[PDB]
Design a binder for this molecule. Sequence first.
Ligand code: NAD
Length: 332
Amino acid sequence: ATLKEKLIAPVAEEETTIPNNKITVVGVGQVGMACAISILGKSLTDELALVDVLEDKLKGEMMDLQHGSLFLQTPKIVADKDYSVTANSKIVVVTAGVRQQEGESRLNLVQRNVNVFKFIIPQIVKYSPDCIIIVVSNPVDILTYVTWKLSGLPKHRVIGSGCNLDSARFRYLMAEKLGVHPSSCHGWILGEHGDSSVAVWSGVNVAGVSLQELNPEMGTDNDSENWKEVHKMVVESAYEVIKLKGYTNWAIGLSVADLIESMLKNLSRIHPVSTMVQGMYGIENEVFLSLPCVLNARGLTSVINQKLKDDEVAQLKNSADTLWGIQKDLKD
Ligand SMILES: NC(=O)c1ccc[n+]([C@@H]2O[C@H](COP(=O)([O-])OP(=O)(O)OC[C@H]3O[C@@H](n4cnc5c(N)ncnc54)[C@H](O)[C@@H]3O)[C@@H](O)[C@H]2O)c1
């Protein structure tokens, strides 16, 4: 007999078991692995599944995480090119595909990554028909639209990581200038996770003190403090980090784990993530971009109607138009 047989006396009959809060990460690159480590570090899942086309890399990553199992609270970690390993996921994070080279627009990746997604998305829904999908691959807003169309899932189950990262960066820069913790500075970057994102100056506050009320020129070119530059630093951050280290991953890995925590803990916390915004702020096409949304175990259940300033509406409209310009020309 096995020493297993000698040591372990069953009390319950053998049974094949179904994970409670399984997460799949598709793509084990810089971003995929950073999401994986953040998810594991927060004990957010009882079963982590990884998928990539690079079989050796994939196995290598799986084994490295497994070797750290002692320090974790995730009893099953599996990896394969074959989507069968992904069955019964609560949440599937897609980080797979091409990324920006230095100075390259996220929008320039669309054609290559649409082809990647045309293969990936149907496999995901095949093995996890009841899942939530979080799209991370760029351009994140467009690929969220693409995923929604390809998957046939309702709007509340298809979410782009969107501006959760931009707002994090914004709140960090704000906190830098004020000497407080980013969590105590409040402000929203909305619209495209990209060059046309929108700083919602009207909602920026510390302890409910409206900063645009203290400084009505906030966000203009007529600004004593220089807030427009903060937004510009938010816009430029990815390019700057890509120029320095080649890609970004840590902040996004943390942003993604933040979103997953809200969903799997059923918290209904509000995050700026990418959703279908048709009919809001006079946006008349099926555009996906970020607005503040309520996230819980069902996914993205609500959007917050804001009282945006006229200029902010115009900026958000421009973002929708930029994104629609690309969306409209897509096939299948
Ligand atoms: N949304 C955000 O805020 C944000 C932030 C950073 C990066 N990104 C995007 O995340 C994506 C990943 O970036 P990265 O640095 O991890 O790239 P990377 O090259 O390190 O990793 C990409 C991984 O995707 C895998 N892959 C390619 N085609 C695949 C397919 N058909 N099926 C399964 N896997 C496939 C590749 O083999 C590779 O391992 C890029 O699109 C990048 O622009 C988004």
